[PDB]
Design a protein around this ligand. Structure first.
Ligand SMILES: O=P(O)(O)OC[C@H]1O[C@](O)(COP(=O)(O)O)[C@@H](O)[C@@H]1O
Ligand SMILES: O=P(O)(O)OC[C@H]1O[C@](O)(COP(=O)(O)O)[C@@H](O)[C@@H]1O
Lengths: 310, 310, 316, 316
């Protein structure tokens, strides 16, 4: 029967706060029917699989378990959250040894699905994942600025008192210090922020600048206050997972392979893209202001120098 | 890529009030990613496909269209609602000529999924569908008493003022005049109706009898009041569709093939069963009282005489 | 207890294909906890209440019943759906007057019940009967709401979505004006993931200007096409009504295209007309004034002008 | 406007792994519209409010913030989570007394705020602190609710589900008593699609009586196992709390196993203990008295008796 393939399977690599939260999000929202959890700490994963399974009588069912790389053989989706924290080039090299020890055995399993990469530094490790896996460009995807974008929208939403789902604004570039806001195209119900400020002059230019600074530095603030950041990215990863598994052709800001867009080549970087069951379908090229295009070039340039050196 | 198969496709046969409502239910609940609508009246289906597509910006996306039997080639699910209304043997023979004109071209398409049958008379046309299609027993499924059961639960729920999802009661047998309630196992939060009546003697025995009579005759009442019945069965069909497509192993009352259960053989009849992506996994055999087992035998016997004659 | 108020109640007026389908949408999505159905045809509503109730064991619970205007006393929401349709003899003014007699016979008893909630109007012609509902009810402007161009907007987005092969939730485009023949598309602000249709066409010159014009014409005329093919249109508006209902009942501050009262916006006054607006538990919070091109602003002025002449003539 | 009340507000007390996870569950499932987070550690709550807010553009909106007891004034729901844990030196009575000082310092200011909603208690030891919360708050019995054996019950169902390979939503089995070492399974009424486990074992004699005993032991001891493997347990109870929260806020009349006040049921009095009960916007509506076997009724009596001795000793 053809319907024997109506069983969706995710392998999660990394059972820290991000991965564990991701899994919980998938459980509550009933996305996928199987989650295998892989981590160096086998006892932690066993415990989490049980704790997560305890939730299932209140949601749709799932097979959940402590897993091994070899369980990726027939998986739809491999989600990588296992990122060693911090020179930048040292950080990269350290995470490359670890990433290779994950990707190689996964490929050897026979895995033939989509890689979703969230480990920091995400754009770089997305490129590294593509390079190591030998998979096509469109089937290796990074979370990129999906979270920064969410943070940006929520910030705007709170300022104007509107549901964030009605706010449309991007953060683009390499996720990190060099990312930038696309104010030229940011809007609320089609009314741009430039037009919004006209109609509501209480909103000072300097508020908007600070708003983006707060977004860019949001991880530092959250870590300072509570030790770690995880609910945002977990929620984003589940959103991306759903777009793939329900074949949505949704537009999301993701780390995607650059083949000419924005005058860039041979890096993964953050931009809006269309995604479905087969991964990336279209890379959307927002036409940026000169100011904005300069930010993109700088972000890309610095990123590319590090990859080449790496 | 393996994820190229994360696209779920339903072909609906019959675009009357039942089928149209089913489709709407699937749209709102975001179940499946494609619905092809097939009916003799091509203009009606074209119109419905458009009207249903107009809803999609408020839900998850779907490809929806007026379709042909040949579009079942790669479908997960074929839902048959096309039932000519009313001797009983005449009714059957009439619906068999029509059913054959549907099933044969669907099989010829290469369809290799699950048949879900709702056309009346459902248990008989479920058997006929199995016989005509040549598919395995567990991949031809009828809606059976899923709707009668829902009606029963809601009736009880209203009487005791409790959420129907907390009421557990079955109607079994052949869907129609000979179906019967399983009071022996019916309960609310594990407290049986027999035990409930003990604790709440306001509930008269004669109320319960009438309650089941009202259930058995519910279609006649609804038709008399508003011309047709459709929201219940559409909702049930969508529930069954979800159990299959999300591989739930849910327990539902369905028309399933009898291989010894209740001392019955070689008919489709209504009983609780476990269902998932591969259709029927287990037929549950409720142990009935003598009174209840007699009702099952009679229901089955009459049904079997009609099939044999047919 | 304060939580005694955590029970949401909708009174639906009109149990035709729109109202019935609305109710079904509310049932499946679990939106309020009580739906009373009111219509001249009491048997129909009794039958629908039962048929809808049959769905409840698969969804969250609800009290559903055939209802009377007096049941609006403590309702959150009154949804009005069944406009008397235009007969081939009649003028637009005739259609309005006919529907005003009927509308009054609904709104007055509802107000007399003590109802103190929000009116959601979908009956055609919607912008006019939204105004009439405000005028008859005496309620505040922001607590009388029409569905306006929410459906036309959905149709527009889905059309674009299909052309570019993208999830319509990722397409952001409005139809504005009076819902009907004089409505118009806001191409200047329409976009897909922030890339405008003007910018999209630059990158994809296969997309001919004429395709876009026709695409909007097909949207404007969509009801005629659907009615011709299957007799009636209902799934789109029912779904929209349920979406608006959810924005109110879950206090969302969602931006939707709705028929809202005009107090200067677009250089218009004292009509209800279609534009994006922010809506929550208290009804309309902000009317968004999209800054239009000259061409687009002209369409809005014409739509408004014709609408206003009819209202003025109607109430005299 | 009456719809000004269509804004649901939860105050969470305790921002440990349970409370935080609860809040996240409420966010993802779109349950109330406002969550105020209260904890001795103000920086933690500020950070969580932000981190949770980051999720909102993917879900329905919510106002989320670091909060104070006085923010309970107009709350629907107060959820209490962070019991001070038992130190290796201390008696059960010591644990209770310690948690009573703390609980009082929470409940009194909440009551003083004007809060007039429902208390949902999850702090361990839950049945006792549910009673203490009732006693301290002065609220009615049916508006103070503990999570009781809702989680143990979930664990039990999932265990059975896994053994028989069936969706746990199709498994109907309770754990009852005081949540903890003295709780017990109700095999007599446990079933899968109406077929009892006694009847299931008849049809499937592979299933050994000893497997079932161990299955319950594993459930009873599940917290110890999970804590041993990963340090803490939280996803199960958070999910349960969100389920109970939804039953209240959507006025469901759902049947759940909860810690409820005993007024004769099972021949018990004046304790909170775990049994199925019907719950809606006004809290507890019916306590369901499952008729137990002699063996099962004995377990309930023992569980209750030990619990009652501790409460009596505690309040003197
Ligand atoms: O993906 P984008 O460009 O931000 O748009 C996503 C959002 O669009 C929406 O459809 C609403 O936006 P608009 O209503 O202005 O079109 C939501 O469904 C969704 O959360
Ligand atoms: O399929 P059955 O036998 O009626 O049970 C289905 C129902 O069981 C439930 O889990 C609740 O029933 P209980 O809470 O008594 O176990 C619901 O999730 C679901 O609607």
């Amino acid at each position: 029967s053809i319907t024997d393939k109506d069983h969706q399977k995710v392998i999660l690599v990394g059972d820290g706060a991000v991965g564990s939260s991701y899994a919980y999000a998938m459980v509550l929202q009933g996305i996928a029917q199987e989650i295998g959890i892989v981590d160096i700490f086998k006892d932690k994963t066993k415990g989490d699989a049980i704790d997560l399974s305890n939730a299932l009588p209140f949601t749709s069912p799932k097979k959940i378990y402590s897993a091994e790389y070899s369980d990726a053989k027939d998986a739809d989706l491999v989600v990588i959250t296992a990122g060693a924290p911090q020179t930048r080039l040292d950080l990269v090299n350290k995470n490359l040894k670890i990433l290779k020890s994950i990707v190689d055995p996964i490929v050897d399993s026979g895995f033939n699905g989509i890689f979703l990469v969230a480990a920091n530094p995400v754009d770089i490790l997305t490129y590294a994942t593509w390079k190591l896996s030998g998979f096509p460009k469109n089937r290796v995807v990074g979370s990129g600025t999906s979270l920064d974008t969410a943070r940006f929208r929520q910030s705007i939403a709170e300022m104007v008192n509107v549901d964030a789902r009605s706010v449309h604004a991007y953060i683009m570039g390499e996720h990190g210090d060099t990312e930038f806001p696309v104010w030229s195209h940011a809007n609320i119900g089609g009314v741009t922020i430039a037009e919004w400020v006209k109609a509501h002059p209480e909103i000072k230019e300097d508020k908007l600048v600070k708003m983006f600074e707060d977004v860019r530095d949001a991880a530092y603030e959250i870590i300072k206050l509570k030790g770690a950041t995880f609910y945002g990215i977990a929620t984003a990863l589940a959103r991306i997972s759903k777009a793939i598994l329900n074949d949505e052709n949704a537009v999301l800001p993701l780390s995607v392979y650059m083949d000419g867009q924005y005058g860039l080549n041979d890096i993964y970087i953050g931009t809006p893209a269309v995604i479905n069951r087969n991964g990336i379908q279209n890379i959307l090229e927002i036409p940026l202001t000169d100011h904005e295009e300069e930010s993109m070039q700088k972000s890309a340039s610095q990123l590319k120098k590090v990859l080449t050196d790496a």
